[PDB]
Amino acid sequence: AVTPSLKNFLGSLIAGATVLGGIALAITAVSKFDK
Amino acid sequence: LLGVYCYMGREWELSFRLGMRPWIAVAYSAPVAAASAVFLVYPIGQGSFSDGMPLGISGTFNFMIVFQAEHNILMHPFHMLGVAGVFGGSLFSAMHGSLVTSSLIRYNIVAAHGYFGRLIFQYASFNNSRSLHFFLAAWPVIGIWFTALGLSTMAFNLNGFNFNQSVVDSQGRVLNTWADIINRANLGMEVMHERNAHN
Amino acid sequence: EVNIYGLTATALFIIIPTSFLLILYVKTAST
Amino acid sequence: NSDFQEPGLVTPLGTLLRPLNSEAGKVLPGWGTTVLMAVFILLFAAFLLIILEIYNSSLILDDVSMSWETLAK
Amino acid sequence: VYPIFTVRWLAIHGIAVPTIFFLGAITAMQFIQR
Amino acid sequence: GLPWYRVHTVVINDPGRLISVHLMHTALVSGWAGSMALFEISVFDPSDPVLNPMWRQGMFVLPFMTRLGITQSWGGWTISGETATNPGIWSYEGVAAAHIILSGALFLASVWHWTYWDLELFRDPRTGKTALDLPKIFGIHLFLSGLLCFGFGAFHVTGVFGPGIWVSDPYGLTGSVQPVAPSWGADGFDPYNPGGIASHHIAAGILGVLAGLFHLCVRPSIRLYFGLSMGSIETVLSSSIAAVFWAAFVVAGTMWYGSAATPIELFGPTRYQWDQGFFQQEIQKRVQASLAEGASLSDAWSRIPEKLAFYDYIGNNPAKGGLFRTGAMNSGDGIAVGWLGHASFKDQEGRELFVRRMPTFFETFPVLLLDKDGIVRADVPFRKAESKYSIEQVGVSVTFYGGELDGLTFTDPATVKKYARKAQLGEIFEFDRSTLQSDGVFRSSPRGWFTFGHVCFALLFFFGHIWHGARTIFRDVFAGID
Amino acid sequence: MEALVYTFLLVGTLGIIFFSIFFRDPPRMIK
Amino acid sequence: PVERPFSDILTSIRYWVIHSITVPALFIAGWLFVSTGLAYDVFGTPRPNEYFTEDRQEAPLITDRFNALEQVKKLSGN
Amino acid sequence: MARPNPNKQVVELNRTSLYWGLLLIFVLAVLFSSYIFN
Amino acid sequence: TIAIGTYQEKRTWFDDADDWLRQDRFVFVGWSGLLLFPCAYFALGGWLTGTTFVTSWYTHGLATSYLEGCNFLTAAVSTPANSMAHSLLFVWGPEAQGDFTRWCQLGGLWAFVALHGAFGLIGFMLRQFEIARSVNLRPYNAIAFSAPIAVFVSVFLIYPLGQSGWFFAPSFGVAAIFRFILFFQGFHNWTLNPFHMMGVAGVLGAALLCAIHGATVENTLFEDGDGANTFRAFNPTQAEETYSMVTANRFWSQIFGVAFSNKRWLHFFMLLVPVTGLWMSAIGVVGLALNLRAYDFVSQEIRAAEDPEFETFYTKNILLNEGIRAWMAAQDQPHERLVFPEEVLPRGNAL
Amino acid sequence: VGDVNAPIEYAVGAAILVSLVATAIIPIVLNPGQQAADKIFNAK
Ligand code: CLA
Ligand code: CLA
Ligand code: CLA
Ligand code: CLA
Ligand SMILES: CC(C)=CCC/C(C)=C/CC/C(C)=C/CC/C(C)=C/CC/C(C)=C/CC/C(C)=C/CC/C(C)=C/CC/C(C)=C/CC/C(C)=C/CC1=CC(=O)C(C)=C(C)C1=O
Ligand SMILES: CCCCCCCCCCCCCCCC(=O)OC[C@H](COP(=O)(O)OC[C@@H](O)CO)OC(=O)CCCCCCCCCCCCCCC
Ligand SMILES: CC1=C(/C=C/C(C)=C/C=C/C(C)=C/C=C/C=C(C)/C=C/C=C(C)/C=C/C2=C(C)CCCC2(C)C)C(C)(C)CCC1
Ligand SMILES: CC1=C(/C=C/C(C)=C/C=C/C(C)=C/C=C/C=C(C)/C=C/C=C(C)/C=C/C2=C(C)CCCC2(C)C)C(C)(C)CCC1
Ligand SMILES: CC1=C(C)C(=O)C(CC[C@](C)(O)CCC[C@H](C)CCC[C@H](C)CCCC(C)C)=C(C)C1=O
Ligand SMILES: [Fe+2]
């Protein structure tokens, strides 16, 4: 069964993926604007 | 003590006999001041030579422990300045050695300055090769002077800081802080040291 | 003879590096 | 030097194993297959995190008991 | 010279805003009767 | 004119000399393994496997051999205390002799490869210069390692062809070598489940093979080829150093915290079992169950095995020891010879008292007899100090249940004080101190020595990784060229 | 036995110090 | 594209117009944050009169890992 | 017995290095002898 | 054959990202910046927030915050309680369950700061490597920083990992660090361990070298300026060195007995001393983490116990350690629930 | 209990004094650094 701790862990995985994607998008957009 | 003072004098004497500038004795005054303090001024303030530092290793450790028991040296500002001086001296020695060794290629200050200015920001701080070495010579010496003066002041027994029972809630109850744990350690140390009942 | 193992350890630690360094110095000084 | 100072010794095993040590320095154009490596690295990191949390009691799973008592299965 | 919202702007503001907030908080804490 | 610390770099180009050097190092390590096996077997005493196991005698390599199936010996004894009749080829002495022979053969191969350095195998057809195809070599070696891992997992650990591995009950009371069936569910990831081992050595094994195949059929991209300096032979050194760094921390952690691959019956108990009252709680539960079932206190306390009481003794805690307290644990506090029995203290009023057990941190701890409510009720002065509650005044008495001193009682304050100071350490035992001339200071078990050594090596290897990686990335600057 | 070892080690250290002070190779590299 | 010198902004009018009305807002925000009592609620720091609960007259102790939330809620009196 | 290896240098150790090594070993022995003897 | 050089292919997103990151601005971001700046920023923010608002009432029974009335020397970010043995204390973990107030109360802020700070140190080392590679200099600053990172890793992660839990790691503060130092002096006799001795020697020698080198260089300058001050008689584009090596060498060869004759060797010795000292200290604390302490000198203990009339400073140090432990464990370890009656507390009156 | 004695009048009075003393000296400390960084940059 999906224990609450496992649900929280999957949520943390999603949040980390979101943070990394945000950083990547920021660098990409800024580089494209400047070049 | 007489030997170290005359060594101090001989440093200047030889510096003068060679054409050098005479300000190495000033740098040497720091360790001499600390040694003179510990070995002569503390016993005078306390009133006996039994309070001097035994010439050994375990003797030095017992010396330090007895101070931490009696005068609370760790919280004295001058000891903080001494610790800062020693740590900063180690840091500056290591980092100056690293930059100078890296720069020297089969440029000494104009090349590594580009590295330093962008590493931790702080552009155009020590761009003069002489000011940098003067700063190196000045930091630890001042630190040791301050710590020696702190020990000398403790000889006449003012004290380190004292924050015991500095936090109290309503109704007058006392809430413990880290200073209280340090004070408990000091109290145990002092109780252990004193013999009181001596036969 | 107390702590024979300690005495042997001290003797080895004082001899082996010393002999190695001295042999290296004599070998290189011939150059 | 000529052919790195004349040819070396030849042995039957050397001749047999020569093919495995011939194409030195060959490479593919572009980035090749780095994206697959990145995906696999991410999966491995997730697996390492999962095991680390399982062994640290930060991720309690129904089946695992996480104690010496599991030896009495 | 013209554009703003650069790296320097973000870097300085990030450490500037919380500093002012915490300075105000501590100054207010000073005047508590305990 | 190479300095003393740049001497071996002369082998940085020719592969044959590198092969010979690696063979020499392998021979040295194999010879060390054989010699230590022989020495430990010569020093081992197999008389008592209950109160004198391996971990009490300072053994280091013997449990590793025993962990994988080696039990019997050529002298007629077994690690379980029984007697062997057919030791066979594979015993302790056989393993040591085999390792020594391998060391010698590797030494001969090393000298041969050192003599014949210039082989055609080390020169590529184009440009006629020495070169190594590192990606393909890595593919071959990884393929081989994965195949070996699969073989070990599916033939030895699972017991289909081999002997199996050491498995024991949770309390380390009855263990032996058995086959281990794989476990695939989520229960195969907790390190205290032996099955999780076998499955891994299968699963990862397969992956290994697959990986190797890929690495033999796909050449690296140019950008990756130049970014990681894959044409140099120092990048691989940094990667390997980092890998062993990581593995050293993994193994040291699993040894310290306990796992299914480090049974307490071979290396000794961990400190976290003493801290959490594992064996104490188990014994208390068993005795309470016996009393509830209906029986006398003496009978209830006389049924617990001596091994279980031995595990509950702070002298066995690996935490307490010294860096320079050399030797085996058996030379620290004497060789155990018997179990006196559980000591119960009762005062004049009648309520039972218990002794506050000594935490791990405290080198010396006062004795405090305190009742069930947690309030101190008796104690001993520090050293000739004024006393308000004292063993003499309160008049506590000690009774012994089970063990050798069964049914006896004592009232003399001296004996009561001595037994209280003995009980503050845990279960009271009898120690022969005249054979090894034990000083009286506790020593650490093999667990602590292993963890300490491997952690120190891991940190030094972290520094080595940093240095060699920096020297690889900065090749041109270091060499003073473009 | 321990006292003799300690005295020997201290004497050796002092002897190395003296030899370094008085029998050093000349510093002609930069002078 | 040259990271205008700090001197240029120092003499600007819009810079001062913005900052002289913005910074005081942050300072007052902090003052009200720690004055209204929001800090105690947000960060869980007990008030001077909430240290010792009616039924407890000593420092608290968690003594529990997987039920630490309920333990802390009970000890704090909330 | 096949061909002289071109990569063959010789180690060199000036006197200052020897003095440093002797000082290091003797100082370490002084520091650690008491602990070894207990 | 089809040969190839470097960067002879079409441009890619990676190329644009690399070009933007490695520009020339007031702050050098670089690739390591992505890992350094966020982590360090959050570490500093967490420390300040913990020292300003959060308290340790429910973990250690203390009051450490400006909101509670503590000075800069007594405020700190206390470690989590001993019950939380080695949990990483995530906000979403089984302990906090997602409540920020309870997360702060239990003490996860310490773990937050420690982890993000360790990753910040890693990022800083990578930044130094990147700068050195960009400006084409050998990376010695990398090792010089590898020393302190090793010390931090040891003290703040390996020591607690061997003990009961995070409760015994340092708390980020001044009085907390003093408590830590006294705690080792009491329980481990850390002052008698050879490794701390070597570290002390290394640090003091580093300070000595710094001071002496500065004094010698500043007192042997060449006459290249009419003004009374020698600071303005120099420019960064000088060709020769500003001080006479021969004069300093002779001076220190006639005063002390041995003097340097090589700039590279001198500055390399400066680099070498402190790194070795701190590495040895780190190894010593790694050993201590397993309670492998140099405490016994068993012969002296046996001799002292045999007859009371034999006292050395070592025995007095042992007694002082006993006093420290007995008198401080009462409140230093609340989870043990220790209550020592005044009869049993060690005191010099009873010897 | 734990309320602030001082009123908001002093809050604003001190805000004005500690807000216009920090927004005008943060660019004066960095000016040397920004002036020297450009000299270092675009040179080597
Ligand atoms: C580069 C910057 C950086 C770094 C290195 C870290 C690192 C860390 N943070 Mg910090 N943090 C950051 C930025 C960063 N953070 C930012 C920007 C914020 C604000 C949003 C935070 C806010 C924050 C909080 C509030 C907390 C942390 C915590 C942590 C720690 C736990 C890491 C973890 O499990 O997270 C998650 C990490 C990952 C998910 C790794 C990435 C792996 C990806 C997702 C793989 C995906 C592949 C695939 C889809 C997965 C398949 C499996 C499954 C889905 C089927 C760790 C030390 C926690 C901690 O330890 O505090 C005590 C904590 O409580 N951080
Ligand atoms: C990491 C590997 C490792 C580990 C964990 C152990 C662990 C153990 N060994 Mg084994 N051993 C090893 C490697 C290892 N050994 C190797 C490589 C050899 C070959 C020489 C041996 C040879 C060996 C023998 C012959 C014996 C042991 C014994 C022991 C036990 C006693 C404790 C001990 O080692 O002494 C305590 C450790 C120390 C005092 C070392 C202190 C470490 C410091 C940091 C070193 C400092 C060095 C310093 C820089 C220079 C000082 C110079 C000074 C001496 C003058 C213990 C189970 C004994 C035993 O019980 O067997 C039954 C025994 O008789 N071992
Ligand atoms: C896989 C492991 C590995 C390998 C193959 C190498 C190989 C090499 N290293 Mg690296 N290194 C390693 C690990 C390794 N190292 C680690 C872990 C560290 C951190 C301590 C270093 C730190 C290091 C430095 C700082 C330098 C090298 C250098 C070198 C080269 C010359 C060897 C040397 O030092 O002269 C031979 C050395 C000696 C003869 C001295 C031996 C005396 C030792 C110190 C004491 C006795 C050791 C004992 C008997 C055995 C210990 C066993 C233990 C490992 C279990 C060579 C290419 C040097 C080089 O060429 O780079 C420019 C160099 O400057 N290495
Ligand atoms: C003469 C007296 C003396 C001296 C010189 C030393 C010397 C030393 N002791 Mg001490 N010690 C002594 C007496 C002494 N000891 C006594 C009598 C005791 C009682 C037992 C102790 C107890 C003691 C303990 C308990 C410890 C030491 C440690 C150390 C070492 C400190 C290493 C260091 O700098 O780490 C400090 C540096 C770091 C941790 C690096 C962190 C740097 C980060 C990345 C910076 C963060 C950025 C920051 C926010 C920027 C702000 C900058 C701002 C401050 C300006 C050093 C060798 C420590 C040690 O090294 O052990 C391994 C240690 O743990 N000693
Ligand atoms: C009965 C008796 C004898 C009693 C003795 C009892 C007893 C206590 C014995 C002593 C025991 C003992 C030796 C204890 C110490 C043991 C100990 C802790 C060892 C530590 C060893 C160790 C490996 C530590 C690691 C760190 C380490 C390597 C430290 C090195 C320390 C060190 C040598 C520092 C340098 C000291 C020093 C004085 C340097 C001065 C250098 C110098 C002359 C520069 C001058 C100079 C400046 C210029 O600017 C220029 C230009 C020139 C040209 C120039 O020259
Ligand atoms: C996508 C996230 C966007 C930002 C969110 C706000 C960030 C600021 C948080 C301040 C604290 C407030 C409390 C939040 C905490 C909170 O409220 O969590 C709550 C949330 C859900 O829990 P529940 O409240 O549903 O649980 C209740 C019960 O069911 C529990 O049994 O937990 C998660 O799913 C993970 C959330 C992560 C949020 C942190 C984001 C960062 C993740 C780590 C990133 C690592 C990057 C590594 C790169 C290599
Ligand atoms: C040839 C041969 C043979 C034989 C052989 C043999 C018998 C061998 C042996 C060998 C051996 C017998 C070897 C040994 C080795 C050893 C070693 C190699 C050791 C090492 C050690 C070490 C390395 C240590 C270290 C350390 C210490 C001391 C402690 C701690 C610290 C340290 C780590 C530093 C025959 C005739 C049969 C046949 C044919 C072949
Ligand atoms: C919440 C949190 C977070 C974050 C945070 C942060 C990011 C923070 C920051 C913070 C900060 C950023 C802070 C700052 C502060 C500052 C301060 C607090 C300052 C102070 C100062 C002072 C006090 C000064 C003084 C002085 C001077 C210098 C002048 C004159 C003289 C004197 C001495 C008076 C997160 C979500 C991630 C997670 C959870 C937690
Ligand atoms: C020419 C030009 C320059 C010089 C410039 O700085 C910008 C702003 C980009 C950005 C907002 O800084 C983007 C910052 C986002 C960044 C990628 C997030 C990750 C890295 C760090 C967290 C950034 C903060 C570092 C700072 C604290 C030193 C633009 C749009 C331009 O056109
Ligand atoms: Fe210099």
Author numbering:
A (entry chain X): 64 to 98
B (entry chain A): 120 to 225, 246 to 338
C (entry chain M): 2 to 32
D (entry chain H): 14 to 86
E (entry chain F): 11 to 44
F (entry chain B): 2 to 483
G (entry chain T): 1 to 31
H (entry chain E): 5 to 82
Task: Quote the study on this structure.
In the high-light treated prf2 mutant cells, the PSII-M complex contains a small single-transmembrane-helix protein binding to Cyt b559 in a way resembling that of PRF2 as revealed by the cryo-EM structure. Especially, the membrane-spanning regions of PRF2 and PRF2’ are highly similar. On the other hand, the cryo-EM density of PRF2’ is slightly different from that of PRF2, especially at the site interacting with W35PsbE. When PRF2’ is associated with the PSII core, it induces conformational changes on the DE-loop region of D1 protein in a way similar to the one with PRF2 associated. Taken together, we suggest that PRF2’ may be a redundant homolog of PRF2 functioning in a similar way to inhibit electron transport on the acceptor side of PSII during the PSII repair process.
Photosystem II (PSII) catalyzes water oxidation and plastoquinone reduction by utilizing light energy. It is highly susceptible to photodamage under high-light conditions and the damaged PSII needs to be restored through a process known as the PSII repair cycle. To restore the function of PSII upon damage, oxygenic phototrophs have evolved a highly sophisticated process known as the PSII repair cycle. Here, we report biochemical and structural features of a PSII-repair intermediate complex, likely arrested at an early stage of the PSII repair process in the green alga Chlamydomonas reinhardtii.
